[PDB]
């Protein structure tokens, strides 16, 4: 009750960043972790404010950057909620766990805690971590399909940090295949410097599903020995095969005349008499009643 | 104000979508029509 | 034929008028420009039809009418059964 | 709006900034051929005595506007190449010269396509603009862009149209603005009250 | 006899069940509509009729068994949908 | 010229004729409210954002 | 109400105050000044009353007065409900244009002055939250009742 | 011939007070009285009443008595105090429709032509409106007797009046779920109205108790309606009744999406009118 834990949990947290950057320069990292667990062990039992919060972001800061287990642990960590963390350590808290679901393939759940990690942030200008989340937030949306205009707040310090990465999503909204490869040699070295390359390498599945939606919506009765030459696939024998998983995933619906070679598609109009715009309402009806 | 504790480190929008379309497709599409009349 | 039919062929109606199929089309021309009988005829499959609009809203509207006819009818028998027991097992 | 502010062209005097009134005539006709359809181009700028005689001194713009109205589709692109080049070197249209023609292409395409339903794709080469595969790559990128309501076939060599209602497309622009305004107010309510 | 799912008989079945030719069954049903014993519509190109309303007849103690049983599971359907009402809108009104 | 509407065919010349007053009152007279209310929230910068 | 009863004017000549208060139950109601102009309290007096209510009457007038029979199990003129759903929204646009107006003349003359001065012409802010209640209960009641008829009626 | 009846809460209370003043007999007494009122514009009105002396012995229950001298002079007084008021018919207390009420009506039809009866409740428990009325119709018809006559229920409700709504709403003071918003309809007809259809479904089950075992008259004129209810049972979900349903859901909820969007910005503006009275008040006052 003297706030000796409370006022010095900040002094714990604020010295840890100097305790880290010394150790992230010339020293080790890992017996501080076991010291941090006992520091976490004494938390939440005696006092239950701002000791549950900072001791977990400072637990994550190299556990992400290591391959140690530490990610399903943070699932079964009860300390996910400290419920209040002073609006700046809380705001990046959703970011450090935001990359966790991204790096282990949890796509759609991650983009809402990436967005919430972006809009709880202060009014500063030299913001190089905000330079990172604005990059990472729409990596995972390229994995899903949606893409906003990223340069909608472009700065004299944001512009040079976007031009390789903005040129990346130039290729995704197109249907070309080696255009992705024209990026992945021109800016392959920059993507490792930001530490994102293992996410970038799997976009070839998303380019071709964007392409097959574009082609099936453009052309109605197209030969399967024509789509491969347009996608520079170099082979018609697997041009049936991507379309096979395109119906297995359910991108396009209609049939293939494999004996002839043309892929017909039905003109599916009047989605107006279907339940699905009410789902676009019911997500947004209830939310605007919440605000 | 304006702190952000650092742990780590119109006129523009419509043409960007138009830059997306003809990014590498027929920028100065001016003279091929003079050369497509005798072919097509 | 507009009252009781839904969709009849061109050849059938011209036979029930005992005249030419062209003379049958001239009869329905100057009656729907009078708009006293509405029709949507055809001269490729001979398929004419009577009182066939798009009906965007009249589906649910006539359905809602069938509820109020039904709910008035379930109220008709409900207060009628209870008196019928009162003339057999009264006292 | 700019054709609506340039609606009059009568009391618009021989001013200082467009020192030729005929330059003002060229600007008000270039914005009119986007902003309004043809129940209104067939009454307002084709019949105005104030607008007919001032481009009677112009051989270029008279041929450029009327080719869309006279359905002279092939010669339409010839002067469209002239205007768009002139639009580049001109000030104040050069911020948006690439946005103009791609709206004038899609307006010249769909005007021809909404007349018929079973128009083959090899008819538009010799009557509308040469290059069959040029038409192919151009129509493929606009249907995929979500406009120009038709549906092209490939191996029986035909272009089919459809007709959608003004419900799905009218619903589409609503969900953009509803997301945009809620993006505005949710970000606002975080900023105020800490 | 037909249930309320279709009750959509064809003219060939009338030509089977009344052994009368094709060129008279249209005259037969317009008489039936005029007297008022049936209320339905008449197609001619698909050769079917959409009968909707029929004249009510009498029945013995066996057809009430069908009207007992088709009524009986319709009772609990009023129970089942209203069960959502007083359980979900319960705190809206005590 | 939209004085009549339908479609024209080239193989044989069939004029499919159809008509519907589709809807116009419900949506676009409700759509401009959104761009009106956009200007209201912009005016809320002129009494709150500059102020508090 | 407030039944009365006379007092003797013989005691008025004596100057003697009647009715000899033994309980703090009489002086609970205050008489009106217009009745005090008349003979109260110089010729008559008030009497406190209550009412004799009983469950033999209480329940059989509550559950019988306003009972809606099958009204909410209707659809309310199904072509015109969505027609009335535009009969409000159209002027609700321009009433929001007033709300796109009245907020813009704030940070101005001290909105206590914006209380006196707005008694001539209509305001958006109260009128604009008015129709939202109307455009909700007309919709939510009618949309819910349509989706209970589909289950119960087959 | 008669549209409906209109019953005021005065006469509703003007029976129960008489049921209490005869409730001391203990054994058996039905409250039978004279119903006063008018009927104008084809709508039956009920305004006033009283009760007439009446007894009934159980053996040979066809001997009733109406002291008509008590019927004459008291109506002679009520016509004198109110010439607008007149006779409208009669009533009885009606637990279970006693037997004399086939010819009580024919005894006193020489005053009112359409001499209507009213059945009331003395023990109030139901989920409806416990006020019943019939009408007198006779028939030289189908099968029963050469002289046949059976009452038919005309619809019944409690009508209001401006003067009595002061007194009616004064005597309640218990509960009154007013403020009709989004949830008055939810309970007056969506909680209750679905359970309204309960006892209407359950009523034809009570007639269904005669499948082979119940009372001896079987149907003849009861089943033409029941044959129609299963026939006029509504349209199944295969047609554009599917499609036009999603059509209006995609239309009605648009207005709900707009209106809810408005409600946020209004209360957001009301937040700014409360930060104008917080930060601009602490520096001034303290």
CB G46 within 8 A of CB G40: yes
- Both tokens of D49, joined, read 């005595």
Strand pairing report for H87-92 and A262-263: unpaired
Could you give the strand order of the β-sheet that contains H148-153, starting from the edge strand earlier in sequence? Answer: H48-51, H32-36, H87-92, H118-119, H132-139, H148-153
CB contact under 8 A, F1 and D166: no
Conformation bin of residue C76: beta by default, left when phi > 0, alpha when psi is -120 to 50: alpha
Q: Does H223 touch chain E (CB under 8 A)?
A: yes
Helix (H, G, I), strand (E, B) or coil at E6: coil
SS (H, E, C) G22-87: CCCCCCCCCCCHHHHHCCCCCCEEECCCCCCCCHHHHHHHHCCCCCCCCCCCCCCCHHHHHHHHHH
What is the C-alpha radius of gyration for chain E, rounded to an integer number of angstroms? 21
* Contact in structure between H138 and H149 (CB atoms under 8 Å): yes
| Look-up of token digits 């701002």 | A50
Q: B1 Cβ partners below 8 Å, 6+ apart?
A: A122, A123
> Scanning every residue of chain E, which has its alpha carbon at the shortest distance from the alpha carbon of C6?
E43
Is beta strand D150-152 parallel, antiparallel or unpaired with respect to G4-6?
Answer: unpaired
Contact A277, D171 (CB under 8 A): yes
Taking Cα atoms as reference points, which of A249, A254, A251 lies closest to residue A268?
A254
CA distance B5 to A88: 8
Residue A219 forms beta bridges with which residues?
A: D152
CB-based burial, H6-36: b 16+ in 10 Å, e otherwise: bbbbbbbbbbbebbeeeeeeeeeebbbbbbb
Contact (CB, 8 A) for H62 and H106: no
Eight-class DSSP state of A150: G
Longest C-alpha distance within chain C, in Å?
A: 78
Burial tier of H241 (Cβ tally within 10 Å: 0-12, 13-18, 19+): middle
Residues with Cβ < 8 Å from G74, sequence gap 6 or more? C64, C67, C68, G145
What letter would DSSP give residue F45? I
Strands E38-43 vs E49-54: parallel, antiparallel or unpaired:
antiparallel
Using CA atoms, how far apart are residues E82 and G122, in angstroms rounded to an integer? 45
> Do residues A147 and A139 touch, judged by C-beta distance below 8 A?
no
Does the beta-carbon distance from D175 to A280 stay under 8 Å? Answer: yes
Please, is A59 exposed, middle or buried when counting C-beta atoms within 10 Å of its C-beta (0-12, 13-18, 19+)? buried
The token pair at H211 is: 């499948």
Resolution (A): 3.0
Q: Which two tokens stand for residue A187?
A: 């800016």
Residue that has been written with the tokens 């190299």 in this structure: A62
Residue of E38, E45, E48 to mutate for C, most C C-beta atoms under 10 A? E45
Burial class (CB in 10 A: 0-12, 13-18, 19+), D114: middle
Q: Give A7's Cβ-side CA count (13 Å radius).
A: 4
- What is the rounded CA–CA span in Å between residue G135 and residue G129? 10
In chain F, how many H helices and how many E strands? 1, 0
Rg for chain A (alpha carbons), in Å?
A: 24
Give backbone dihedrals phi and psi of E17, rounded to 5 degrees, phi first.
-85, -5
| Residue with token string 């181009």 | D41
Q: What angle do CA E20, E26, E27 make, to 5 degrees?
A: 85
Torsion over CA: H48, H50, H56, H61 (sign) = negative
Interface membership of B25 toward D (CB under 8 Å): yes
Q: Please, where are the H alpha helices in chain D?
A: 2-5, 21-35, 49-52, 59-69, 73-89, 97-113, 124-128, 132-143, 168-191
Secondary structure percentages of chain E, helix, strand, coil, to 5: 50, 15, 35
H243/A281 Cβ within 8 A? no
Task: Map residue G95 onto helix, strand or coil.
Answer: helix
Partners of residue A291 in chain H, C-beta under 8 Å: 264
Q: Cα separation of D33 and E24, whole Å?
A: 63
Q: Which tokens is C73 given?
A: 């009818």
DSSP symbols for C5-27 = EEEEEHHHHHHTTTS-HHHHHHH
Nearest-10 Cα torsion for G110, G115, G117, G118: 130
Contacts of E among chains (3+ CB pairs under 8 A): C, G, H
CA distance G30 to chain F (A): 51
Residue D133: count of CB within 10 angstroms of its CB: 11
- Cβ contacts (< 8 Å) between C64 and chain G: which residues? 74-75, 78
Token couple for D65 = 């506007």
Radius of gyration of chain G (CA): 30
Phi-psi region of H59 (alpha: psi -120 to 50; beta: other; left: phi over 0): beta
Tracing tokens 């039936």 back to the chain, one arrives at: E32
In whole angstroms, what is the distance from residue H109 CA to residue H135 CA? 12
Tokens of G51: 């009412």
Does H touch B (3+ CB pairs < 8 Å)?
A: no
């Amino acid at each position: 009750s003297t706030q000796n834990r409370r006022a010095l949990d900040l002094v714990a947290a604020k010295c840890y960043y100097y305790h880290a950057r010394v150790y992230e320069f010339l020293d080790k990292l890992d017996v501080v972790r076991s010291f941090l667990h006992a520091r976490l062990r004494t938390a939440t039992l005696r006092h239950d404010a701002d000791g549950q919060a900072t001791l977990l972001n400072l637990l994550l800061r190299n556990y992400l950057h290591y391959s140690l287990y530490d990610q399903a642990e943070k699932l079964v960590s009860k300390s996910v909620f400290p419920e209040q963390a002073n609006n700046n350590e809380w705001a990046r808290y959703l970011y450090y766990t935001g990359r966790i679901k991204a790096i282990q393939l949890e796509y759609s759940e991650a983009r809402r805690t990436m967005t919430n990690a972006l809009r709880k942030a202060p009014q500063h200008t030299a913001v190089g971590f905000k330079q990172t989340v604005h990059k990472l937030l729409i990596v995972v949306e390229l994995l899903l399909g949606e893409i906003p205009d990223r340069l909608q707040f472009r700065q004299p310090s944001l512009k040079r940090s976007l031009m390789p990465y903005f040129l990346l999503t130039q290729a995704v909204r197109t249907g070309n295949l080696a255009k992705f490869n024209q990026v992945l040699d021109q800016f392959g070295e920059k993507f490792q410097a930001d530490g994102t390359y293992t996410l970038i390498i799997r976009l070839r599945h998303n380019v071709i599903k964007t392409g097959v939606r574009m082609i099936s919506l453009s052309y109605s009765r197209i030969s399967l020995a024509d789509i491969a030459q347009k996608l520079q696939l170099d082979s018609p024998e697997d041009a049936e095969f991507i379309v096979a998983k395109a119906i297995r995933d359910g991108v396009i619906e209609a049939s293939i005349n494999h004996e002839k070679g043309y892929v017909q598609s039905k003109e599916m109009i009047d989605i107006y008499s279907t339940r699905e715009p009410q789902l676009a309402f019911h997500q947004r009806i209830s939310f605007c009643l919440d605000i | 104000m304006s702190e952000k504790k650092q742990p780590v480190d119109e006129d523009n929008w419509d043409d960007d979508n138009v830059e997306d379309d003809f990014s590498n497709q027929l920028r100065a599409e001016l003279e091929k029509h003079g050369y497509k009349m005798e072919t097509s | 034929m507009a009252k009781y039919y839904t969709r009849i062929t061109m050849k059938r109606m011209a036979q029930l008028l005992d005249l030419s199929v062209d003379e049958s089309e001239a009869f329905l021309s100057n009656l729907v420009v009078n708009k006293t009988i509405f029709a949507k005829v055809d001269r490729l499959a001979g398929i004419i039809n009577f009182q066939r609009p798009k009906d965007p809203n009249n589906l649910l509207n006539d359905w809602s009418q069938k509820l109020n006819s039904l709910m008035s009818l379930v109220n008709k028998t409900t207060h009628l059964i209870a008196k019928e027991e009162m003339i057999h097992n009264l006292q | 709006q700019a054709a609506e502010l340039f609606l009059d062209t009568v009391s618009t005097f021989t001013s200082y900034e467009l020192m030729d009134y005929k330059t003002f005539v060229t600007y008000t006709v270039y914005v009119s051929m986007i902003a309004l359809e043809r129940p209104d181009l067939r009454e307002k700028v084709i019949k105005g005595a104030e607008i007919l005689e001032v481009l009677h001194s112009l051989p270029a713009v008279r041929q450029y506007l009327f080719s869309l109205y006279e359905c002279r589709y092939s010669v339409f692109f010839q002067s469209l190449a002239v205007v768009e080049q002139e639009m580049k070197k001109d000030w104040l249209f050069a911020p948006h010269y690439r946005y103009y023609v791609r709206e004038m292409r899609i307006h010249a395409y769909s005007q021809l396509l909404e007349s018929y339903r079973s128009l083959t794709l090899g008819y538009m080469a010799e009557a509308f603009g040469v290059g069959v595969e040029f038409i192919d790559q151009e129509l493929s990128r606009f249907i995929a862009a979500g406009r120009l309501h038709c549906k092209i076939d490939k191996v029986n060599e035909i272009v089919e149209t459809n007709r959608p209602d003004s419900k799905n497309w009218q619903y589409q622009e609503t969900i953009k603005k509803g997301d945009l305004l809620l993006n505005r107010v949710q970000k606002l309510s975080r900023v105020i009250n800490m | 006899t037909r249930p309320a799912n279709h009750r959509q008989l064809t003219f060939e079945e009338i030509a089977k069940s009344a052994k009368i030719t094709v060129n008279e069954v249209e005259l037969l049903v317009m008489k039936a509509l005029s007297v008022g014993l049936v209320k339905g519509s008449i197609d001619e190109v698909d050769k079917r009729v959409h009968m909707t309303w029929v004249q009510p007849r009498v029945l013995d103690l066996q057809q009430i068994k069908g009207m007992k049983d088709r009524l009986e599971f319709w009772c609990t359907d009023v129970k089942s949908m209203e069960m959502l009402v007083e359980h979900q809108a319960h705190d809206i009104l005590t | 010229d939209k004085k009549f509407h339908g479609i024209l065919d080239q193989g044989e010349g069939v004029l499919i004729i159809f008509d519907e007053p589709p809807v116009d009152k419900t949506y676009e007279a409700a759509l401009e409210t959104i761009q009106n209310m956009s200007k209201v929230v912009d005016s809320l910068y002129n009494k709150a954002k500059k102020l508090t | 109400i407030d039944a009365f009863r006379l007092i003797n004017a013989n005691m008025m000549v004596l100057g003697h105050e009647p009715r000899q208060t033994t309980s703090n139950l009489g002086h609970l109601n205050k008489p009106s000044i217009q009745a005090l102009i008349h003979g109260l309290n110089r010729h008559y007096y008030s009497i406190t009353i209550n009412y004799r209510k009983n469950e033999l009457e209480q329940k059989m007038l509550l559950n019988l007065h306003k009972k809606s029979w099958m009204e909410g199990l209707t659809l309310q003129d199904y072509s015109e409900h969505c027609k009335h759903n535009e009969s409000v929204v159209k002027e609700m646009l321009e009433l929001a244009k007033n709300y796109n107006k009245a907020v813009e003349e704030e940070d101005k003359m001290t909105p206590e002055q914006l209380a006196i001065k707005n008694v001539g012409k209509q305001d958006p802010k109260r009128h604009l939250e008015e129709h939202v209640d109307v455009l909700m209960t007309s919709n939510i009641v009618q949309c819910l009742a349509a989706m209970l008829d589909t289950v119960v009626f087959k | 011939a008669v549209q409906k009846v209109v019953v005021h809460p005065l006469v509703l209370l003007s029976v129960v007070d008489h049921f209490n003043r005869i409730g001391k007999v203990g054994n058996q007494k039905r409250v039978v009285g004279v119903l006063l009122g008018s009927w104008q514009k084809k709508v039956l009105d009920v305004s006033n009443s009283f009760a007439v002396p009446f007894d009934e012995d159980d053996k040979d229950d066809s001997v009733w008595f109406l002291d008509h001298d008590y019927l004459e002079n008291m109506y002679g007084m009520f016509k004198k105090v109110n010439a607008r008021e007149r006779i409208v018919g009669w009533y009885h207390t009606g637990p279970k429709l006693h037997k004399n009420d086939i010819a009580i009506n024919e005894l006193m039809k020489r005053y009112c032509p359409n001499s209507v009866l009213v059945i009331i409740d003395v023990k109030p428990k139901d989920l409806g409106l416990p006020t019943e009325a019939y009408i007198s119709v006779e028939e030289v018809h189908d099968d029963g007797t050469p002289t046949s006559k059976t009452f038919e229920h005309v619809t019944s409700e409690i009508g209001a009046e401006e003067a009595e709504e002061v007194g009616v709403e004064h005597l309640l003071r218990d509960i009154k779920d007013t403020t009709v918003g989004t949830l008055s309809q939810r309970i007056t007809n969506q909680v209750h109205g679905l359970k309204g259809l309960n006892s209407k479904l359950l009523d034809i089950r009570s007639y269904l108790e005669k499948v082979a075992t119940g009372k001896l008259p079987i149907n003849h004129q009861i089943i033409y309606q029941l044959q129609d209810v299963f026939n006029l049972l509504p349209d199944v979900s295969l047609q554009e009744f599917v499609k036009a349903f999603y059509l209006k859901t995609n239309d009605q909820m648009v207005v709900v999406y707009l209106a809810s969007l408005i409600r946020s910005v209004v209360a957001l503006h009301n937040l700014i009118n409360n930060k104008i009275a917080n930060r601009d008040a602490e520096k001034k006052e303290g």
